Amino acid sequence: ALNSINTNSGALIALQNLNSTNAELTQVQQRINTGKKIGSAKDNGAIWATAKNQ
Amino acid sequence: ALNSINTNSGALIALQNLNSTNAELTQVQQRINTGKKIGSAKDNGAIWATAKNQ
Amino acid sequence: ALNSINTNSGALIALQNLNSTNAELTQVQQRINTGKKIGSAKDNGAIWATAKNQ
Amino acid sequence: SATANSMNAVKDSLQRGQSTIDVALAAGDTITDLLGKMKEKALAASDTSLNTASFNALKSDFDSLRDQITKAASNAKFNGVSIANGSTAKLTFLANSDGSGFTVTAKTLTLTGLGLTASSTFTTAAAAKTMIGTIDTALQTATNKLASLGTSSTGLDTHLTFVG
Amino acid sequence: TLTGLGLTASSTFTTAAAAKTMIGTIDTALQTATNKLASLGTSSTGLDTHLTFVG
Amino acid sequence: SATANSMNAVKDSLQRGQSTIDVALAAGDTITDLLGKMKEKALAASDTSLNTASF
Amino acid sequence: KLQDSLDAGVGNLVDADLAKESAKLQSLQTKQQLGVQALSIANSSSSAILSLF
Amino acid sequence: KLQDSLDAGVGNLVDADLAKESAKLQSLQTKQQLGVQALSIANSSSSAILSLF
């Protein structure tokens, strides 16, 4: 509600946004560490299989 | 969890990529040092045995 | 690509150009050494066989 | 409120699925490196200019890499389940409180799932010339299986965010 | 060991014909020795790969 | 934003096209050197003063 | 030459552009600290109720 | 002449091409510094949780 103490919707939305931030940061950290934008099958399965065979 | 303090899986992935870089660096050093892409039986056993007999 | 650490295409092109230069240097050294532009069958097989019979 | 609480078990199931797929992808990287080395061995062996000793050496290396492939395939399990060793047709992970499940179709990586047999080899240079194409087909199907597993993992991740 | 190469500890050549045979004996010994060492190196590389996987 | 992202696949297409033309150009250098050698061979062969074996 | 062109093609497929990722890195670190501040301001919201009584 | 050719053949089989190794060395060293950088950024992650309390 507006002045509830059981529930805190704004903290929920802020938490979801912070989680998206940390996910973006983890992806960029992996991209700097390995030096590859597709470092695994997860990144893009089609391009990854192509590059592996080549 | 995602905001855990006990566990830091991103540090785990980063350490694994770091260890891979260290391994590549070590083998490039061994090649610069010996001058041989097959310097030992651990590099390519068949070609190494062939070269020894020849 | 452009700023990739894994791959250095310009070094590959420079290495190819340098290797071609070394090949030309080798064939000039052989001409200075033996005094013949057809010192072997590899240089020109037809003229080499003709000169051998003559 | 009871529904919102059961969402926790849903999230735990999706995370278990991503963990199993991670172990399968690690085994897949091992198998793909071994398959590339096996293709190089068969390629060198196809040459008829080799003498008998070099041919036997290349043959023994090919066989040893074969055994390592089957070992890496069998060793890829996460807490007694596996999506790559071919022990089950499928695995189904939860997607809602009502029990409807995200489905993951298993992709075998064992030698039989690659089309190789546990005792495949070449005894003659012509057999090696056939083995080049055999290993190439095996590498192709292996990479396609691993790519499908990677897409399944990314889909489990996106559904995890939506469940949250 | 010498028995693992097909040599024996007592082996020698007492005359030129025996040396002519010993050429082939030593060549077979070197061949089987290098093949054994190559198989050892392959198994070592396999141990390294499985160690990375277990990590 | 979706357009801005699809531009990546566009870039990959153009890069694949450049790599294809590069392999073609390398084989073309080989073919041109072979063609020049064959022209010299035909040129020397046209001479009537050559004997049988040289021809 | 063919081996070199194939390796360059794999590099075109997978390799990242590190300069762009460096700019994104610094931006994301700033956005992370801003997110932590906003989350703290959100968590403190219920304190206002206490003073009404 | 046969002895020379056999030595050249062993060199063809097992000799490294150092000019390639140079560029791979410098690139791997840059990758190493970047990997240590990324691992430190990874270690620092948990500290933000203190701010919320």
Q: Specify whether the CB–CB gap between D11 and D163 falls below 8 A.
A: yes
- The overall longest dimension of chain C from CA atoms, in Å, is 61
The burial class, CB within 10 Å (0-12 / 13-18 / 19+), for E17 is exposed
State phi, psi for B37 to the nearest 5 degrees. -70, -25
DSSP state of D78: B
Q: Is A7 on the interface with D (CB under 8 A)?
A: no
With contacts defined as CB-CB under 8 Å, which chain H residues touch G33? 48
Q: Within a 10 A sphere around the Cβ of D134, how many other Cβ atoms? A: 19
Q: Specify whether the CB–CB gap between D47 and B31 falls below 8 A.
A: no
Q: Is G5 on the interface with F (CB under 8 A)?
A: yes
Q: Within a 10 A sphere around the Cβ of F4, how many other Cβ atoms? A: 7
The burial class, CB within 10 Å (0-12 / 13-18 / 19+), for D96 is middle
**How far apart are alpha carbons D152 and B26 in whole angstroms?**
35
Cβ pair B46:D54 closer than 8 A = yes
Cβ pair A30:B18 closer than 8 A = no
Which residue pairs from C18-23 have beta carbons closer than 8 angstroms and sit at least 24 positions apart in sequence?
C18/H19
Q: Residues 6 or more apart from D13 whose CB is under 8 A from it?
A: D93, D94
Q: Specify whether the CB–CB gap between C3 and G18 falls below 8 A.
A: yes
| Mutation site, H5, H27, H36, interface C, largest C CB count within 10 A | H27
Which secondary structure element, helix H or strand E, spans residue D91, and what is its range? strand D90-94
Closest Cα partner for H34 from G16, B21, A25, C11? B21
- Which residue in the block uniquely carries the two structure tokens 């392999």? F23
Q: How many CB pairs under 8 A join C and F?
A: 7
Q: Residues 6 or more apart from E41 whose CB is under 8 A from it?
A: B40, B41, B42, B43, B45, B48
> Taking the alpha carbons of G24, G28, G31, G33 in that order, is the dihedral positive or negative?
negative
With contacts defined as CB-CB under 8 Å, which chain A residues touch H37? 32
> Taking the alpha carbons of A51, D34, H22, B37 in that order, is the dihedral positive or negative?
negative
Q: Residues 6 or more apart from D116 whose CB is under 8 A from it?
A: D66, D69, D134, D135, D138
**How far apart are alpha carbons E41 and G40 in whole angstroms?**
58
Q: Is A34 on the interface with B (CB under 8 A)?
A: yes
- The overall longest dimension of chain E from CA atoms, in Å, is 59
For E26-54, give one letter per residue: b (16+ CB within 10 A) or e. Answer: eeebebebbbebbbebbeebbeebeeebe
Which amino acid does the sequence have at C34? T
Q: Is H17 on the interface with B (CB under 8 A)?
A: yes
Q: Is A10 on the interface with C (CB under 8 A)?
A: no
**How far apart are alpha carbons A38 and A49 in whole angstroms?**
10
CA dist D122 → B48, C34, D113 (Å): 21, 47, 20
> Taking the alpha carbons of F13, F17, F18, F20 in that order, is the dihedral positive or negative?
positive
Q: Where are the alpha helices (DSSP H) in D46-124?
A: 52-74, 111-114
**How far apart are alpha carbons D63 and D68 in whole angstroms?**
9
Closest Cα partner for G4 from D108, A26, C54, F22? F22
**How far apart are alpha carbons D48 and D18 in whole angstroms?**
48
Q: Specify whether the CB–CB gap between E46 and D64 falls below 8 A.
A: yes
Specify the length of chain D in residues: 164
E neighbours by CB contacts (3+ pairs under 8 Å): B, D
Q: Specify whether the CB–CB gap between D32 and A52 falls below 8 A.
A: yes
- The span from the first CA to the last CA of chain A, in angstroms, equals 58
Q: Specify whether the CB–CB gap between D25 and A40 falls below 8 A.
A: yes
- Which residue in the block uniquely carries the two structure tokens 């045995």? B49
Which amino acid does the sequence have at E11? S
Specify the length of chain G in residues: 53
Which two three-digit tokens encode residue F16?
């694949």
With contacts defined as CB-CB under 8 Å, which chain G residues touch C2? 17
Closest Cα partner for B8 from D130, D105, H43, H33? H43
With contacts defined as CB-CB under 8 Å, which chain C residues touch F41? 46
Q: Residues 6 or more apart from B3 whose CB is under 8 A from it?
A: A19, A22, H49
Q: Specify whether the CB–CB gap between H34 and A35 falls below 8 A.
A: yes
Cβ pair C46:F41 closer than 8 A = yes
Cβ pair A33:H35 closer than 8 A = yes
**How far apart are alpha carbons A43 and A36 in whole angstroms?**
10
With contacts defined as CB-CB under 8 Å, which chain C residues touch G14? 6
For A1-13, give one letter per residue: b (16+ CB within 10 A) or e. Answer: eeeeeeeeeebee
Cβ pair B52:E34 closer than 8 A = yes
Query: What number of CA atoms fall less than 13 Å from residue D100's CA on the CB side?
Result: 5
Of G11, G14, G18, the CB nearest to C9: G11
DSSP state of F5: H
Q: Is H25 on the interface with C (CB under 8 A)?
A: no
With contacts defined as CB-CB under 8 Å, which chain B residues touch D57? 45-46, 49-50
